[PDB]
Design a protein around this ligand. Structure first.
Ligand code: BJV
Length: 223
């Protein structure tokens, strides 16, 4: 069965909120955030992974442009191709494009595969968040109400299903009935509720939250 509510922070699978600054690298944070949860699920260690590693190294082969945007799916493919990603501690974030400085000596996680979920299916997103872990998603976050969000369940009538900002679904629930997705942003802890925003759930793929979801996996052998 599916829990009525999920918050992956309760199980210690979510690192501290990061602050991307003036580097359009939300895709990098969304991808590492999803992989961090799998690293903890599979090994028990919660380590921040290096978004800067993706910004510098997951580039033109993966359709990504560093501080000018990119994609969580191909970020995961780089980690598969590279056979690792560095910890954030060892490859820290500078909010600018750099030369690739990946060092395998400090590799903290790998990725075996990733799964893309079907467009707009909030039921399938719910099941993945419940049974797999946090899911990387894009949202339409260009509207002023997103930038000003403080609390409650976010609903914006002008939102569309075209995504323009990468975030991390770490759970779901309802606020006094009002169904929401628990969303980790990368605008530091002063955005929203200590860096989190609850976004309207089951209201016709609101703000595109279920448009392009994906999550990575770390496989233990096989049968
Ligand atoms: C103009 O600025 C933009 C515009 C777009 C984005 C973005 C994005 C984004 C996009 C996707 C996304 N995957 N796929 C499927 C795969 C596409 N790929 C093809 C080639 O490579 C591999 C994957 C699509 C979209 C977008 N769609 S669509 C228009 O929605 O139909 C078309 C199909 C998945 C995750 C993210 Cl995150 C980011 C910025 C910069 N951020 C600005 C900003 C906005 C608000 C608040 C703060 C900052």
């Amino acid at each position: 069965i599916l829990p009525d509510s999920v918050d992956w922070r309760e199980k210690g699978c979510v690192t501290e909120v990061k602050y991307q600054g003036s580097c359009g690298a939300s895709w990098a944070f969304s991808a590492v955030g999803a992989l961090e949860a799998q690293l903890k699920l599979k090994t028990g260690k919660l380590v921040s992974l290096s978004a800067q590693n993706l910004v510098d190294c997951s580039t033109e082969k993966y359709g990504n442009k560093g501080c000018n945007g990119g994609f969580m799916t191909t970020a995961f493919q780089y980690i598969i191709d590279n056979k690792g990603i560095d910890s954030d501690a060892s490859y820290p974030y500078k909010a600018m494009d750099q030369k690739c400085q990946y060092d395998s000596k400090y590799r903290a996680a790998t990725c075996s595969k990733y799964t893309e979920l079907p467009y707009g299916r909030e039921d399938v997103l719910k099941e993945a968040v419940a049974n797999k872990g946090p899911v990387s998603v894009g949202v339409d976050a260009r509207h002023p109400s997103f930038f000003l969000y403080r609390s409650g369940v976010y609903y914006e009538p002008s939102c569309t299903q075209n995504v323009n900002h990468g975030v991390l679904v770490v759970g779901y629930g309802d606020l006094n009935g009002k169904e929401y997705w628990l969303v980790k942003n990368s605008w530091g802890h002063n955005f929203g509720e200590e860096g989190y925003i609850r976004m309207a759930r089951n209201k016709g793929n609101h703000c595109g939250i279920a448009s392009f979801p994906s999550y990575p996996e770390i496989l233990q052998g096989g049968g």
